[PDB]
Design a protein around this ligand. Sequence first.
Ligand code: AMP
Ligand code: AMP
Ligand code: MOO
Ligand code: MOO
Ligand code: MG
Ligand code: MG
Lengths: 418, 418
Amino acid sequence: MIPTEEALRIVFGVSKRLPPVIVSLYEALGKVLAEDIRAPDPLPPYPASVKDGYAVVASDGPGEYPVITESRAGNDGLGVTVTPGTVAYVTTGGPIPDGADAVVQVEDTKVIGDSKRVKILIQTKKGTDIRRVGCDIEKDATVLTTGERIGASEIGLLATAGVTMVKVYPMPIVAILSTGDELVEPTAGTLGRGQIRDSNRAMLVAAVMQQQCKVVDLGIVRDDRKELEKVLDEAVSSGVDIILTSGGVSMGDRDFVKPLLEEKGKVYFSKVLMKPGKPLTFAEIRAKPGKTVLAFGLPGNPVACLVCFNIFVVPTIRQLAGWTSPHPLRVRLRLQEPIKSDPIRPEFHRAIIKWKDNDGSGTPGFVAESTGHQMSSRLLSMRSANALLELPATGNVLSAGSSVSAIIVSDISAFSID
Amino acid sequence: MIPTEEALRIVFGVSKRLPPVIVSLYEALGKVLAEDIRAPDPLPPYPASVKDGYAVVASDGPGEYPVITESRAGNDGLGVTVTPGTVAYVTTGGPIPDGADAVVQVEDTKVIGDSKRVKILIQTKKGTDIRRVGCDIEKDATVLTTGERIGASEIGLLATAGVTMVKVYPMPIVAILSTGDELVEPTAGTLGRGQIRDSNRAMLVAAVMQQQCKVVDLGIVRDDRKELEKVLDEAVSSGVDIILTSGGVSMGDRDFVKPLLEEKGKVYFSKVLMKPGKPLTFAEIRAKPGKTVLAFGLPGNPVACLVCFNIFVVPTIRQLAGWTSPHPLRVRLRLQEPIKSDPIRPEFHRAIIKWKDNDGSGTPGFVAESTGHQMSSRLLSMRSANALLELPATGNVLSAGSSVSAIIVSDISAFSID
Ligand SMILES: Nc1ncnc2c1ncn2[C@@H]1O[C@H](COP(=O)(O)O)[C@@H](O)[C@H]1O
Ligand SMILES: Nc1ncnc2c1ncn2[C@@H]1O[C@H](COP(=O)(O)O)[C@@H](O)[C@H]1O
Ligand code: MOO
Ligand code: MOO
Ligand SMILES: [Mg+2]
Ligand SMILES: [Mg+2]
């Protein structure tokens, strides 16, 4: 039985970034760049007005001048030179005509007469309200680098640079199955004796969908060694990168996941020192030519299943997808209520955390409430939980107001405020 | 010109939650529940073993006993009664046979002889390692409530309860267009004089895709009043809930977005006291029978466009989609470098924030680095920015180590660690 820190080190050392692919612009969203992106031309590519107003020769100063052209876009004012004693109308983003060296915003001007004459009311300075060529982005500047995750602003930079086919690291494809003679589909109505609905599979499909991976749903598998071997062989040869099973990893006489993974590939561990649970099998299997497939034999208890997904599977998905920082966000927070820690196993205690202007100590900070009873069979303990408090194995009661480390497991930008 | 707090109050007061719809299980992921969910049966629905081992009569105590049945699932052991002086083999999740009142885990037992006899090595207590009927979830208990956002554990609870068609609030459908005679498609190679690639549209499409809304891409629209009126009329009658335009809201003689929104609907504001920018038009339009459509005339400057999306459009999407807490997460943090605040406009200064074990004050906390020059034309200032620092309008230099409020704009659970 190994500590969680070692189990994750093992997973990190085995997990390899996937080969890069070329995708379209909107397919690149959420993916990690596998190439640097250089601007092919400057931004702006022409001297551009910051304001609606008039392009002037700054040394002319306040006075009445004829408006010799109008410049908003394209070839407007092409061939026209703004000479001393003349001005040109410009709109925001409009090309500055040759000869003009400053822009006077329309608020500092007045149109004179019934054609084309304007009164400049101020003394401007050379370069005022003009964006010189390349001031926002220089031609050939690197605007995005390999290993950078693509968000909305990064899509905007790719579009600025005219890139519509992008080299990225792909997301892994994940196969998911449930195991158990006691399971029935979640469409079941009245349950027969000794039956429960399969909840782990839909929960894991949803968890994987939140990680933006393609899912291969392999359904329910019974506690029969030959049947599970056939489904695992089919999953391995299908092209997936990760296989997630749940259940079939306890001490029962029909628990075949661990021995089948030991037969098909290399099992790095099968027991982890943590609460909730203990069994968690991690294996590397080679598909027949070929490629490597990672397998997690997740615990069957719903809580243990999702906690193991959050702690071990999420960073594996991120590493395969090329993230340079796959670790989850860890923060420090104060407990809103007392919590008893376990005397042997460090606990991943589910909590609902929020940021408060006063965390109890008179300074702003995160605070946490427990989701209640932490039994691994109680999926209600995961309900609304956006963090796992890392409780060391001391057996002591951590009083309300004490500080603990916590792993943030759900959208920190989707946190409900205090 | 109104303060941002008032502009958001106006948007909140006008924005209405969309009518609920019925979706399939996986379509419910990320959506807000529009009905409570009650468990139709208990979990477990039968007394279930916590361990692999033997179901016993606790008062029998240590001794050698015949194994009278094996119970793993379904009807295993149906009609069999465990009487004093007998035991039954059980696996985790297996139904406890009638008469047994405790489970002795296999580690506390030994199989005797070459048929079916076991030595119980301990004195157990009644109820040990048994999950009574309903201990995880009681029949008719409310497992999820209206207004709760559906994550992976909530999908798991829906599956537990046998719900595969769910009543939720839908996401709004968003139409997006760009405006400008200077724009060309982002597929353009060599740019002609006075042309830039349209970057706002792809950036906004990506931003809306991150909010999980369907996008209607209406393309580039020129600075022609009749053309923009036709596209806005077509967008309004198409069925969308929100229309996002960018550009065409400055002081130029061909900026038609504000007057067209004033003609088609009710403009609540067109100018906001904030840095970056100033113009931002918000309007409510009635589609011909019917329904309401919200329109944001976003600023054309790329930075101002995305900042206005993050501050005003994201909470509007969330309110329409039924979120009870649409406001973004705000935290308090320390500056890693000095920043000059503006003397008139409160600034939404872009930053890259991270959690540190020491934030500079000797206690853990968030810290922020500026993305550099904050000019609104400089989309590189949004690159990697996961927060907007809220700098009040004091004109003073905020030194490194000083505390400021910050809006978190990107996945807090996807934050790269220190
Ligand atoms: N797919 C599933 N959905 C809900 N509960 C499960 C699932 N698989 C296993 N379990 C339960 O988790 C516990 C451990 O299962 P196992 O790991 O197969 O021994 C037992 O109570 C099982 O009934
Ligand atoms: N879709 C767009 N992509 C990139 N820049 C834009 C876009 N629309 C407007 N701009 C620029 O933003 C500034 C303000 O534009 P406008 O709001 O139309 O006056 C000008 O420099 C425009 O060229
Ligand atoms: O895996 Mo546990 O024994 O419910 O903490
Ligand atoms: O909208 Mo600004 O004038 O670049 O701070
Ligand atoms: Mg099982
Ligand atoms: Mg324009």
